[PDB]
């Protein structure tokens, strides 16, 4: 472990056989600055201020990812095809701000200890599935080389609606449901 | 029954201490969750981390062009991007929203950077005994959160004060809660 | 004008 005032990743480069798929992102003190949409070839910055003064070209990410694809296939042979081990993720659900009934708020679903980085995070309202007003972060890196992902559900809290965060992972036998209510 | 996956990670990390004065880079080459090779700027050469690493570490250490480019990354990536951090991340100052809900929870919401100090007061006095605070909560959208609970047995005249300090403030945020009935 | 972000390059494993 290294003691520093600030820790940054320029960047987190991920490529997995399943898919196959990959990820490119820059992190600063555990927060995601941007991610590159490798299909669209676009940099998606997380804060508005950042675009004004910073610019990352997507090709650099795509090029790094090709190198990772090359390295992966060589290291799989050297390891005698040792596969990834499935970890049990930890789910925590909390609101963004204090709950005021009938007023804009966001429900936060933290999924920690994710490995490997393949996960389904969905929201339920009174048991039924919600699709609109749902956003999520990329797979945020951890020092132990596992990941955490945070899902968001914008809503106006009410006395008649109860929510759940359904998480599907290979390290789970059944989908994990974490309940939240105002 | 579970799908097979082979995972590769590359982490290009920068460690910054005392403004610009101290900068350290560590690049990490990871197979699944195993770091097998790394370049540390304080070391200056590639080092294997597990028996999976010597073929990669020795080969990159035999390429003087690879060594030069990686050593220079402390300037071309770390010191460079830190100048961009001073204009962005290290500029961001989000003031906390402090509220009291009734035993008495002081919720300090949506602030940036992480540094926070919350203090509970009953009337004139400060309260050390009955105070239970949650750890710092990362929301993931460049804001933090913290909730400080206070075990209180409220009397008739009592005024409860949550006192909050943060780098974004010149003076502390004082929020009060008067005793009911 | 925004300045170009620096990025680390992964070292390439020996193909042969």
């Amino acid at each position: 472990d290294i003691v520093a005032d600030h820790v940054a990743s320029y960047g987190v480069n991920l490529y997995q056989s399943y898919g196959p798929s990959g990820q490119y992102s820059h992190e600063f003190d555990g927060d995601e600055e941007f991610y590159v949409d490798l299909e669209r070839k676009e940099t998606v910055w997380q804060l508005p201020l950042f675009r004004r003064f910073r610019r990352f070209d997507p090709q650099f990410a795509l090029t790094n990812i090709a190198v990772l694809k090359h390295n992966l296939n060589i290291v799989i042979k050297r390891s005698n095809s040792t596969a990834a081990t499935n970890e049990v993720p930890e789910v925590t659900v909390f609101s963004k701000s204090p709950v005021t009934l009938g007023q804009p708020n966001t429900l936060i679903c933290l999924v920690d200890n994710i490995f490997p980085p393949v996960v389904n995070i969905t929201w339920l309202s009174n048991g039924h599935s919600v699709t609109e007003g749902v956003s999520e972060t990329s797979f945020l890196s951890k020092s132990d080389h596992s990941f955490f992902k945070i899902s968001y559900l914008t809503f106006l809290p009410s006395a008649d609606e109860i929510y759940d965060c359904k998480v599907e992972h290979w390290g789970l036998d059944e989908p994990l449901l974490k309940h939240w209510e105002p | 029954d579970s799908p097979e996956d082979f995972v590769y990670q590359f982490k290009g990390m920068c460690y910054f201490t005392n403004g610009t004065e101290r900068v350290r880079l560590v690049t990490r080459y990871i197979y699944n969750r195993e770091e097998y090779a790394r370049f540390d700027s304080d070391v200056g050469v590639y080092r294997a981390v597990t028996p999976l690493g010597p073929p990669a570490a020795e080969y990159w250490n035999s390429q003087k062009e690879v060594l030069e480019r990686t050593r220079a990354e402390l300037d071309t990536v770390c010191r460079h991007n830190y100048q961009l951090e001073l204009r962005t991340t290290l500029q961001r100052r989000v003031e906390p929203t402090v509220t009291i809900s009734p035993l008495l929870v002081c919720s300090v919401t949506d602030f940036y950077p992480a540094q926070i100090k919350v203090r509970w007061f009953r009337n004139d006095q400060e309260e050390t005994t009955g105070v239970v605070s949650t750890p710092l909560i990362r929301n993931g959208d460049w804001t933090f959160q913290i909730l400080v609970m206070l075990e209180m047995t409220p009397q008739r005249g009592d005024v409860y004060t949550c006192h909050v300090e943060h780098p974004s403030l010149q003076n502390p945020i004082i929020v009060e809660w008067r005793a009911q009935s | 004008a925004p300045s170009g972000e620096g990025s680390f390059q992964p070292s390439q494993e020996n193909p042969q």
Partner: T-cell receptor
């Protein structure tokens, strides 16, 4: 290390030509550059491990390929007099900031 | 943007000189020097990543600052006559391509 065929090419307008390149032994990334008297040395395209990477202000008339043996082919169709230039192939070990090593080049002359 | 000066240089045998290569951007990945015989492929000379960096081989010495790079040529011979090309790799660029300067046509009069 980098070889390029043919060394010279003389052809009529409207024709299509193929320029080949063999990178340095062990080099996985290839880059094409055009050297004209008007624009000087300009980047066309890059290939790594058989796929397109960086791309210049190249025209739809221009297309390249990188074969599994890592040799590249630069295809220039519907040729104009302005396409008369030197076409250099460069190769590097990896596709990042690695040193780019140029081939002898192909001199193309497009005549009416 | 990468600029080279002078466009042409006429030196006498043994007459030491310097070649300038300015780059207006900030965000370097690498600065490269090549020597090109007319019609032949550019021949690689030096790579500099960082300000205060310097490299030397034979009669050539390359240096780097935040604004530019100098190519110092001490006591040149007629064999040193060529087009000296400066190229940059940049963060602002759409990948790892090189952006070349206009070059310096060096002519060493014996």
């Amino acid at each position: 290390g980098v070889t390029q065929t043919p060394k010279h090419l003389i052809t009529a307008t409207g024709q299509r030509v193929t320029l080949r390149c063999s990178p340095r032994s062990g080099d996985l990334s290839v880059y094409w550059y055009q050297q004209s008297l008007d624009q000087g040395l300009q980047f066309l395209i890059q290939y790594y491990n058989g796929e397109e990477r960086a791309k210049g202000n190249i025209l739809e008339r221009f297309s390249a390929q990188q074969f599994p043996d890592l040799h590249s082919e630069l295809n220039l169709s519907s040729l104009e007099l302005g396409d008369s230039a030197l076409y250099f192939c460069a190769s590097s070990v990896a596709p990042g900031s690695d040193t780019q090593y140029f081939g002898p080049g192909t001199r193309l002359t497009v005549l009416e | 943007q990468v600029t080279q000066s002078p466009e042409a240089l006429r030196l006498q045998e043994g007459e030491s000189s310097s070649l300038n290569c300015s780059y207006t951007v900030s965000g370097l990945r690498g600065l490269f020097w090549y020597r090109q015989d007319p019609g032949k492929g550019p021949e690689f000379l030096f790579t500099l990543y960082s300000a205060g960096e310097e490299k030397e081989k034979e009669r050539l010495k390359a240096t780097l600052t935040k604004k530019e790079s100098f190519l110092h040529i001490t006591a040149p011979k007629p064999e040193d006559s060529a087009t000296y090309l400066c190229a940059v790799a940049l963060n602002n660029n759409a990948g790892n391509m090189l952006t070349f300067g206009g070059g310096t046509r060096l002519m060493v009069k014996p």
